[PDB]
Curated annotation (Swiss-Prot), chains E, J:
This is 6,7-dimethyl-8-ribityllumazine synthase. It holds the Pfam family DMRL_synthase. PANTHER family: 6,7-DIMETHYL-8-RIBITYLLUMAZINE SYNTHASE, 6,7-DIMETHYL-8-RIBITYLLUMAZINE SYNTHASE DMRL SYNTHASE LUMAZINE SYNTHASE. InterPro entries: LS, LS/RS, LS/RS_sf. Belongs to the DMRL synthase family. One of its GO terms (biological process) is riboflavin biosynthetic process.
UniProtKB/Swiss-Prot annotation, chains F, K:
This is 6,7-dimethyl-8-ribityllumazine synthase. Pathway: Cofactor biosynthesis; riboflavin biosynthesis; riboflavin from 2-hydroxy-3-oxobutyl phosphate and 5-amino-6-(D-ribitylamino)uracil: step 1/2. It catalyses: (2S)-2-hydroxy-3-oxobutyl phosphate + 5-amino-6-(D-ribitylamino)uracil = 6,7-dimethyl-8-(1-D-ribityl)lumazine + phosphate + 2 H2O + H(+). The lineage of its organism: Bacteria, Pseudomonadati, Aquificota, Aquificia, Aquificales. The gene is ribH. InterPro entries: LS, LS/RS, LS/RS_sf. It comes from Aquifex aeolicus (strain VF5). Its EC number is 2.5.1.78.
Length: 155, 155, 155, 155, 156, 153, 155, 155, 155, 156, 153, 154
């Protein structure tokens, strides 16, 4: 319909990737980009699984992998136990129903895997365009092992 | 009605994103990229709501959020009280008939939320292409707290 | 399909308008009347915005305007700062998922604009037909600056 | 099967709404306006559920809510314990084969929720047109706590 | 395509009519109701065709007529177009503020160029067309205002 | 649409005013989709709606006077003499509205009316018919009220 | 599409029925089996009513009926007052949005009918396949008057 | 590619359900019944995710939930820390090319969540038909805490 | 013609934008990108329609705006007074006729608005691909206040 | 059919290119991008056609070329296929682990059979293709690794 | 697709390296949908893209030297004598890449180049063109850089 | 036709006044049979008349200043600094008239004319443009007069 969606999505993806590469710490990607509302609802906690849950699991794995990497052939592989880790979360406010679904999924994943709620840091940004700039500060904070970005974009 | 509409839009979007990431301050992107003048008018101060109002609201929220951030789980969320903040508006001069509407909407939003007109700053660029080059110089000032870029793009 | 929807919607609209006109205080209208479920979901906090958020903003503006009106040419215009105001909320229970979405949006709007949660008064009525009669009491209460009605009707 | 189905339905709906607004007591509108006898039967004590049961439940909830109202944020919500309340049923006599079903459903709902049959009051009007004229006189009694209007309309 | 348009339009029309009949003073209905943005913009942009001018002119004539009526051939009552010394109150919807400002400027221009001073015009803004009736009723209850004009835009 | 809103609102206003003030208010609003049929209906001598409006107003006024003053039967007369009327005519489409006003006044005079008692008011728009007719109906000297107008789609 | 849905649904239904018959206590069935997402959303608290609410009401009625049965012609019929009863709830985690909708509906029904929240026992199982095995323990617990199973299955 | 695909699938599903109900311990059913080899491959370690990983996760959650259960309102929810549990895997040997993938996925899930390989137990049955007969004997051991059945079915 | 039209166009546009943002010096981009030759001829034939004049006036306005920026509300604008300014033109050699037309238009615009030919520095680059690399050096030359890039690209 | 595929693929490609240009050491792109699972499986299963072998071979040649370049006719620089004494770091996506393991085994077999010892290979696993760039950048910043290979699968 | 990703990435790398290192880097990547049109374009004596690449590199190097050393006009010469070049050629489709390299070297020699100064590098894949050309461009002895390759859909 | 009569009369009046008063009277009037082509000529900011008309007025004012105050070549610059203008507008066709007036004023201000030196006068019909323009030109402070109007053929 409009190139607004294309520009927003490409820009946020490029910003998140550049931020992750420059700051050298994992930033997970939970921006559900959908053409219609049906598939967005499907991926927002419905039959196709919670993308927030998947992103939280990926963040846990990446944090453990980086811990093991900094601390025959040697194989580097991170566990899924999230005990003793601190995660940062950035969530868009647009489409707040699906956003809250994803946030609940991610928090549930972290808590069930072992992360205490005292370690989760949540930041709400008005739109998905503002995710990279806030994620920059959340990642530059040294007490954040991994950052997660969460948002919804629908054509 | 620019022929290289996609090129100009991509360049200005990437420029604004890179400037925001480098300068670590909110640069809201309220730009109306419409494929037809019908939807351009429908988004410029009409049924779908003017982009200027939404951009100003997002800028206020991001400014408050950044102030709080630089100042169970910890939740950082920005208010909507623009009393005591400084904003810098950049406006393209190509399509005056709609840019004036967007600028009026943004200024009205700021004033109603509580921002004095003595604090905002307006910079008129001739074309939508040279939005980020001026936006960077505007944001580099330590007095301006948030930046709002405004332009119209038609193919 | 059936004239039940037509009768319910027309009756509730007429009742709300007559109540507002007779009691001389703002009553905002958040009755999402939709032909299908898709557009109802769209307007219930999805891409088309939160009608509860819009109604809360309208109620804040009307309350401020009435305060200024009771307390070249003179122009009367209300601000959007909701500090020191008390709002009444009436919410239908039918379609409680979308209703809770709208209620969360409205409460979030009021709290972010400045209204303390100690001033919001919530009343749940079983159906949208019962909104006018309860809104009558909520508006006849003298401590309520503005009333909001919230409901969902789907053909 | 009345020819002026739309006229009668609109008049009775507006009458019930105006009576409820003027008398400030709940008058539940459980009336089955169906375009065809098939859906009329489908709604009268069948797969879609009888209107009488829903109307009685709504009346009980509204009566409890009004009792509580006249007696963080404050939330007023009505229970479903009809023990100790007084209800007045108005029933059209046009289509007995379905009105009897609706009345039986409503009385059963009240009795099961805990309302003694000594407290309810039933008034049989000949046609659906003269529902509000009797409903007003019934509601004006200070003993009756809630009113339930019941009728069948077919085109 | 939603019944929201129909309900809002019918309700605001009924509210304005009831207010006019109750308070016995002229309230003029400058509310465009259009199915297409094209025709809405056409009506708003047409200088004389814009409802802001016509509603203001009708309000002036009705105010003069009421003044004359309160003040052997068949008595014929009619009002002039001289707005010298009258008082008008405009209530403008804020939705679709481009066309709204067009109509409001048209109405103010009509009043001023027909004679009314600027200090005799009171302008109130309501966030939506739904909130027009209550503000219009407040302005009409204000006994100083001689006539009321309600300006709004509704588009399907 | 806009036509529907205006027509419904003016009809509601007239009916509500008649019911509230308890005096005859007569309807002379020609609602036409095309100008041709309205011209056709107005061109007839007796076919003008103003004549029917005046006749109905006279009959209703006489019936009201009789009611206020086998089975009982009440019915109004056509003795227009000794009655007071208030006509409210729209200015839009004055070409045909003049025909209708001529018909109404002619009917009243031929049944015994006095131009001294007949009172005429002109309204810029059909939307202002109820509010203007309200003053005439509230004036206790006026016995019957007639509204005249044309609405075209 | 696949027989996976058929097998899961038939197996869970058979397991629940066999468990109820063997343990001789009511187990209510809130497994929304839908071919598409539209009707599932409709039945998950939307226009077609809350199946969780219906299941909670059925469980209350069955518990009261069993109490009366254990404690002209004699007619056995249970009331709807849920005062002094303890209910067990089993909820699937798949499709957690609709599941939370159903759970909120059921808890709201119980609380409004009179059951205190100190008597509700909630158990979350990862999938709908695991509902029978957990319901077995929840029903073998002697302090549970009635058990409710809640889940969503979509083709 | 078995001809009596429906018969074998129904029999094994009913067998697993009955065994779980009788033995009162979790027997997760991760079996890939696909009508075509294309979707079989799409579900066996591909875009849709391997069934083994999901089955192992469900088994871990059910084991933790049962441990907690046998050990406002009370909410019982299982964690995802497989450290200190015992699992018994049953695997059909019909389609090795996919069963090996599923078994590798399940073992990887358990190991990453924290389960030592010294605790899991693997039993290879020749065909998918004789899954429950071995599953019962495996679950009857008091050392095995959870059971996971794995097989491929194609028509 | 151009072998890789999209690649060349995107490359030159992104290079110009990045150079402008990095050097904080206005670079105007007037390049005729057309599928056909006749479209380019149309875009270049007109006096003001040709990109030369528009690019010249845009560079003049940007230079004046920057002169204002370096040293009710505050508004920054730039007049169309080219007196006292030095510009740097970079023209592609390909499509010599169109490029010469555009360069003549730009030079005529500068002279007419009040620029002396002694301050204009012209550079010729053999290909459009080499426009940004030369523009970088021309802009790094502090003698120049604004850079202009002129070229024709045809599919 | 979603733009998620396009965004992920373009972003990982840009990240790998930027890392290679910044750190001046060869990073090879063994990431299959396919619209159909059929062609994805075909490319993964083809022994020589599998990207694991080709990426490893290209990495070996590039490592030798860089070694030679850092160490009257026109100077021609070229690398042999002898991986004796080099160091390689593989970063494998875990999504679609069947084809992923196929490609990883192919790459390891290529390196070992061309000469590299097993102790000189470092294998890192990332949960998704999106996380490949950061791990690849960490491995490249590790100065011990001579060349980097990024193995992944993306299917529409 | 894969072709689009590779082509876009190599173009981005070349342009970014040229802008960062402030020295001419020339493009000789033939992007063709079919092999036939690429063969047609490569078969011509002057039509080979290597000749155009070498000519543009020489002109840009001379222009850069002049810039570093009515209105002012800067423009490069074709005096290839006294210049240093670094060619990076892909190995894939060596049949046509050899034609292109021959054309480039022939142009440089005929305009005054020295094979002693000309430096050639072979890359196994087109994906490795930017990273390999980075070293040649960073070598300050090299004045111009040329990349040569073929991409076919 | 009447449209032709009006157009010829306004053109003749403007030419006569310009010649008799010796100051530039720029003529921005869009005369068209149909509103579609009227809007076609009104849009396209360069093709929009107002900007070009103001530009020509500035050029003529500068040329006249140079004239009053090898071979000798006289030519006007595009610097509106220190110049006073008088704009006459036609109220009819307000939609396009607003755009044209905005364009003319924007051109003057951007080139350097201060808003304290622009005098705008509106006339109800295009027939009244000549006499108002004559009054503005007879005013001594005004240097150039720009007459802006739309004409539709019937």
């Amino acid at each position: 319909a409009t190139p607004h969606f294309d520009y927003i999505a490409s820009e946020v993806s490029k910003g998140l990737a550049n931020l992750s590469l420059e700051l050298r710490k994992p930033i997970t990607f939970g921006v559900i980009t959908a053409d219609t509302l049906e598939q967005a609802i499907e991926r927002a906690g419905t039959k196709h699984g919670n993308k927030g849950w998947e992103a939280a699991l990926s963040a846990i794995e990446m944090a453990n992998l980086f811990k093991s990497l900094r601390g025959s052939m040697e194989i580097y592989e991170g566990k899924l136990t999230a005990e003793g880790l601190r995660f940062g979360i950035v969530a868009s406010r647009f489409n707040h129903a699906l956003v809250d679904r994803l946030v609940e999924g991610a928090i549930d994943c972290i808590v069930r895997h072992g992360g205490r709620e005292e370690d989760i840091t949540l930041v709400r940004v008005p739109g998905s365009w503002e995710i990279p700039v806030a994620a920059g500060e959340l990642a530059r904070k040294e007490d954040i092992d991994a950052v997660i970005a969460i948002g919804v974009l629908i054509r």
